[PDB]
Amino acid sequence: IPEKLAFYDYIGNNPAKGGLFRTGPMNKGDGIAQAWKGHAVFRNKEGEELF
Amino acid sequence: METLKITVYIVVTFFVLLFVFGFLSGDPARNP
Amino acid sequence: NPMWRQGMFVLPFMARLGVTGSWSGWSITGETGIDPGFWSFEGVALAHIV
Amino acid sequence: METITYVFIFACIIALFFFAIFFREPPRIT
Amino acid sequence: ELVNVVDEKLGTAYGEKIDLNNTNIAAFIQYRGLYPTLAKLIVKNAPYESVEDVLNIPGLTERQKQILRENLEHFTVTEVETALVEGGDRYNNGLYK
Amino acid sequence: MEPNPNRQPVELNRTSLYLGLLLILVLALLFSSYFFN
Amino acid sequence: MEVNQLGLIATALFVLVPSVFLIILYVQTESQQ
Amino acid sequence: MEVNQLGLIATALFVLVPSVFLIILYVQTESQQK
Amino acid sequence: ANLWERFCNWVTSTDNRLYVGWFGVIMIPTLLAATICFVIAFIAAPPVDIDGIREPVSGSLLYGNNIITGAVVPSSNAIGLHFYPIWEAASLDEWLYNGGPYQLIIFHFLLGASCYMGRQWELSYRLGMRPWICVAYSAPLASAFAVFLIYPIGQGSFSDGMPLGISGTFNFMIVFQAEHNILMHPFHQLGVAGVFGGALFCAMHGSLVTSSLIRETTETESANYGYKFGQEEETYNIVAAHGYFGRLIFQYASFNNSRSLHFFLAAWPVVGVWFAALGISTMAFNLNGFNFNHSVIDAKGNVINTWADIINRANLGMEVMHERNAHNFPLDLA
Amino acid sequence: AELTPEVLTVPLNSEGKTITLTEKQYLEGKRLFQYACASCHVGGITKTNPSLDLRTETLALATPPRDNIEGLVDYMKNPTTYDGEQEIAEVHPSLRSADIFPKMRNLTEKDLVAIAGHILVEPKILGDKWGGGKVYY
Amino acid sequence: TLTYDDIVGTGLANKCPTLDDTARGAYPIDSSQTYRIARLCLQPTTFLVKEEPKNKRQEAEFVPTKLVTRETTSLDQIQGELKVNSDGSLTFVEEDGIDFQPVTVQMAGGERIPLLFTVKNLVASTQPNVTSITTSTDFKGEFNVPSYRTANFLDPKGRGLASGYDSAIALPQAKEEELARANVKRFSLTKGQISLNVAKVDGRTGEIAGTFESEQLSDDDMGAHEPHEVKIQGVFYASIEPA
Lengths: 51, 32, 50, 30, 97, 37, 33, 34, 334, 137, 243
Ligand code: CLA
Ligand code: CLA
Ligand code: CLA
Ligand code: CLA
Ligand SMILES: CCCCCCCCCCCCCCCC(=O)OC[C@H](CO[C@@H]1O[C@H](CS(=O)(=O)O)[C@@H](O)[C@H](O)[C@H]1O)OC(=O)CCCCCCCCCCCCCCC
Ligand SMILES: CCCCCCCCCCCCCCCC(=O)OC[C@H](COP(=O)(O)OC[C@@H](O)CO)OC(=O)CCCCCCCCCCCCCCC
Ligand code: HEC
Ligand SMILES: CCCCCCCCCCCCO[C@@H]1O[C@H](CO)[C@@H](O[C@H]2O[C@H](CO)[C@@H](O)[C@H](O)[C@H]2O)[C@H](O)[C@H]1O
Ligand SMILES: CCCCCCCS[C@@H]1O[C@H](CO)[C@@H](O)[C@H](O)[C@H]1O
Ligand SMILES: CCCCCCCS[C@@H]1O[C@H](CO)[C@@H](O)[C@H](O)[C@H]1O
Ligand SMILES: CCCCCCCS[C@@H]1O[C@H](CO)[C@@H](O)[C@H](O)[C@H]1O
Ligand SMILES: O=C1C=C(Cl)C(=O)C(Cl)=C1
Ligand SMILES: O=C1C=C(Cl)C(=O)C(Cl)=C1
Ligand code: OEX
Ligand SMILES: [Ca+2]
Ligand SMILES: [Cl-]
Ligand SMILES: [Cl-]
Known about the structure:
Helix content of chain F is 62%, strand content 0%.
């Protein structure tokens, strides 16, 4: 999966998440993105995948 | 760079000629 | 870290219509060592000032 | 912000030159 | 972790004697008969495992070996330090008067 | 240069000054918290 | 409090620029004959 | 560059306060009856 | 009429708000080129390897300078006196690294400023004036030639020309003192007498004329309203001014003749600044200030220091520190 | 302080014989040192080789010893490297090379002695300033 | 035949000698004679700098650069022993010469990369059984890359390794730990590698020429920042002589 595709699937790039007086670039909020950590898969003790 | 050089050479030559011909065009007689 | 993460407002309008390179050698698609000619981002800015 | 401040003040000075020369109060003989 | 290796070298015998592996060549002027002929040979044939190895420089005359023996008390050897021997600095270290 | 006949004097009376300063100062008192954030 | 540093200059110009505009207009009104 | 943050407001008021003082005096001079 | 005649009449017209003239045909493009390059460089130019040792010095505002530290940095010592136009560089990137803008600016400036001087002659001729205002201007102009052209020629490099910046000027002055003892040079001393004296006589003349304005105004209005532009009568009583000045010093110390007075006002600073320019232009060939280092010796031979020896100690501190990575051999011979 | 006979007494040879210079000799030596030597040795240093100076302790450790009149006079006739291994008249002014160093052509034995006495006396006056360079100016 | 006055200012002085397109011969090696390189010349034509990416999963690439220090880049007058090894390979052992050039190249966007382009102390060997040098002969070897500045170099605040201040004297009471990397100068010494591909051989004259690729680290500013990897490509010339 391209990092660029994964990065679009992230709410910090959603333009409906801002604030009227939270000024400047998006990088000023969550930071300057460096790398995809990879896809997180959660599981319980029974081994079922959870979402 | 070659084009810049030729351009500047043309520009400079133009103004220097204006200067030389200007002072030849009866400059002593251009006084009050 | 594309332009829209960086608070860039006029850069995308230059890019939208074909100005994608800098005189310093970069392009917004991540290329290096491009010759944009006069109509780089800097040339656009200078033309508007003049 | 400091570069903007320096260039702004400089630019205001050049504009003042333009008004001081071309929009001066004209000298009038009396 | 960050250490000035030249200041560190001053805490070894390099700070007390002529180090045959590191010291700039003008230091050999401090003693009779060493400069410039032996001084050149010493720097050219460095480094030395021990001071007495300086006696084994090929081509030394019998008198030269004798003079070196008289001055071993003024010599030392330490590990070669890159910062003191690069740049040709053993022949000219940028210090004059 | 011939005088422009379209020129007009401009006026602001003292009440308008007080009203304007009130508007400005109260807008500042209101918006300053959001500028400091 | 970690306030925005530009808040001070923003507030100062917000007050001063329109206030001086009104003062300029008021004073030149008073000085008219 | 780590400049003093008050440098900006200091410079801005330094320019604006005396400039506006002069502009007030000039404009009300022009508006006096001629 | 033909167009060459109409254009030539426009060029030499005494009715243009700013006089153009034939010197102006050269002055205007060269000063515009110099001015535009200077402003762009002062704001945005990258660091420049002034001393040719791959140690680039930052001059521009965007690369960390303020108004006081910023400069257009002189061209590289590796260039020396070689002509370095833009089209000599492989790229603008190379040109900027090596100090190209500096050469572009100073050569256009010096040409434009020399034409400024001719333009002053030209308009005075067209207006029917006497001609020598341009001679007064030759003093600052000569000084600019000294620090931007002559001194580099003598030393072999435009990297030793005066930098185009406030702190860079001070660097030039301090290195100059280390290498030439300019304070101890009589031509610089004449320079100081010129500008100290020029400032003194400026204040003096201003105060004496102002002291003797004829009363034409009331107590509230500015006294300047007492003079109308173009009036035939002189606006002050020079007999009263000199009756004051002759008693301040003694009777004969005064310039009673306004023409002699105003000639002196022109001549004193202009002559002093001529010598200042000649100081720089001759120290350019290393004929340096007086050297009295160890001049005073006691009966045994001990050196007895004077204030000259203290100056020498300060000069030494400048000398050993300047361009700290540039010298490999013991003598700084240029 | 004065330039006394004691100050003007300098070693003649390596065996400890001294010689007492006249004030005239010292002045002549200083003049001749300026005439023929100071362009490289001003103040006791050596501009073309700063590693070697004219300090008396440096001269004492040269080979053969140069910290005396005869040693210095021999040097001005036939100069050598500091270790005595090589004769350097071809690049150092000397009576032996006066054809190529013409300022040596008219030096008498007395002149060489006077120059030597200057080199030995000056550190007795100036101390560490002689051969110290600009640090000591 | 050219003289200095034919050449000065043309840029030719920064170019290595070349061999004709007819130079496709073979230089015989006699295993009982000793050999030397009388002259080795390396002329760089391309400087590439490896980009440093934020995520280490993507493989970094070498990008083009712009040379800003003019025609000052070539190594020349390099000489050294040319050994015949028992397996028939040849080993060049560099002894002396103009074997380094400081070079500054600029990346897109303006970042300047200084490096000490060098083959100091090169030892480079061919394949086994080189009975003659041909256009199939190659040299591979390693060399040393010492600090771009040497030990006396003083930074703009007067700090250095073998000279200079040992602290930031303009900040007399600041805490020292945060400034240690800038205050404490360190002398780098690293390895580079080079390949020489012989493309032309004049069998009669002992001259050869070809292309090279070398990799080495750039200036680390006496330990102040991490260096970059640089790849240098160009042409080379060498003359071989009986010694
Ligand atoms: C069409 C207008 C427009 C838009 C959409 C943008 C958009 C952007 N700007 Mg640009 N900019 C603009 C015009 C614009 N700009 C102009 C005209 C200037 C010169 C001042 C600038 C100078 C500028 C700078 C210097 C910077 C930006 C930056 C940005 C980015 C962040 C914006 C932000 O934080 O806003 C915050 C918005 C607000 C806090 C809203 C203000 C609402 C006001 C105060 C309300 C006033 C009410 C009024 C008094 C009521 C009167 C009532 C009365 C009638 C009674 C964003 C992409 C930033 C960036 O990231 O650059 C890379 C940045 O540093 N812009
Ligand atoms: C001389 C010609 C010229 C050219 C080639 C450019 C080019 C550019 N401009 Mg500049 N500009 C110019 C003059 C020019 N400008 C002038 C005179 C002004 C002052 C008004 C500006 C002010 C300006 C601003 C404020 C901005 C630019 C920007 C730009 C860039 C983006 C263009 C864009 O998106 O516009 C989009 C244009 C339109 C969407 C046109 C809308 C037209 C409406 C719909 C017309 C309706 C009227 C019509 C009569 C209806 C009937 C039509 C009929 C055919 C049926 C581009 C490099 C942008 C930029 O990147 O800045 C750095 C930007 O923000 N320009
Ligand atoms: C009055 C107009 C004028 C003048 C006199 C100059 C002069 C100069 N320019 Mg500038 N320039 C100008 C306008 C001018 N410029 C304009 C409008 C632009 C924007 C296009 C530029 C952009 C520009 C750039 C980008 C550069 C220059 C550079 C230069 C310098 C070298 C030029 C050269 O080598 O030509 C040489 C010309 C010739 C050899 C032929 C000239 C023909 C005459 C007849 C030759 C005989 C004249 C003789 C020597 C003296 C006659 C004097 C008279 C009294 C008789 C020189 C200082 C370069 C520079 O500054 O390098 C440091 C440089 O890089 N100029
Ligand atoms: C009280 C102490 C003192 C005083 C009074 C002086 C006085 C002077 N010094 Mg000295 N100096 C001093 C201490 C002092 N110095 C010390 C301590 C040092 C060692 C650190 C020096 C080392 C020193 C050096 C190295 C130099 C001086 C020079 C001078 C002269 C400088 C003024 C000048 O050049 O006018 C001349 C006028 C000009 C240079 C102006 C040229 C203007 C051009 C033609 C036009 C400019 C137009 C501009 C760009 C745009 C205008 C804007 C507008 C159009 C909008 C002046 C005589 C300088 C000198 O003699 O120059 C020849 C010089 O180079 N001094
Ligand atoms: C940056 C400045 C240059 C711009 C560069 C790009 C060129 C833009 C295109 C041309 C625009 C022209 C605008 C000029 C307006 C003007 O000045 O008019 C003033 C008058 C009015 O024109 C008069 O105009 C009359 C007709 S009318 O008024 O136009 O209708 C006419 O009859 C009369 O003869 C004529 O003199 O023109 C003149 O006085 C003669 C020309 C003077 C030119 C001076 C340039 C000086 C530069 C020197 C270097 C300074 C360095 C920087 C210092 C900060
Ligand atoms: C980026 C460039 C920025 C440029 C700077 C622009 C500066 C311009 C600022 C304009 C300010 C104008 C102010 C005019 C103020 C003013 O002049 O008012 C008085 C004015 C009276 O007008 P008249 O027609 O009587 O004319 C009299 C003349 O002397 C006026 O010029 O009425 C208006 O202007 C209509 C607007 C109503 C204004 C409402 C006042 C609000 C009451 C108080 C509200 C606060 C308290 C609320 C408590 C909850
Ligand atoms: C420059 C051209 C010189 C002039 C003129 C003179 N000397 Fe010199 N001197 C010079 C050099 C380069 C050296 C070192 C040579 C070497 O390789 O050893 C010297 C050395 C001396 C010495 C020996 C110093 C010592 O042993 O410590 C002496 C005594 C000396 N020089 C004396 C001397 C005299 C008397 C001169 C004028 C007559 C003179 N020198 C001229 C360079 C130059
Ligand atoms: C940083 C903030 C800056 C904000 C700047 C705001 C600037 C405002 C400029 C206002 C200009 C006022 O414009 C001014 O108007 C007055 C009338 O009103 C004119 O005055 C004119 O009319 C009056 C009244 O009939 C006559 O007495 C007078 O003789 C005549 O000249 C002035 O000639 C003009 O200078
Ligand atoms: C305001 C100064 C104008 C400077 C002009 C520089 C022209 S530069 C020129 O521009 C062309 C684009 O039109 C390119 O195709 C070309 O590669 C480039 O060399
Ligand atoms: C007001 C004068 C400003 C002049 C600036 C003109 C830049 S011109 C610009 O330069 C780039 C860098 O090499 C090139 O890539 C490009 O081809 C060229 O057009
Ligand atoms: C008309 C004014 C244009 C002035 C700017 C010209 C330089 S262009 C400038 O160069 C920098 C360093 O190379 C880059 O970091 C930057 O992205 C680029 O915009
Ligand atoms: O003697 C004088 C000197 C000066 Cl500086 C004057 O201004 C006057 Cl008015 C008379
Ligand atoms: O002695 C003088 C000193 C100076 Cl600065 C002068 O200008 C004149 Cl004119 C005579
Ligand atoms: O460049 Mn500027 O200053 Ca005239 O001396 Mn040499 O060179 Mn560098 O040192 Mn000192
Ligand atoms: Ca091959
Ligand atoms: Cl300096
Ligand atoms: Cl040097």
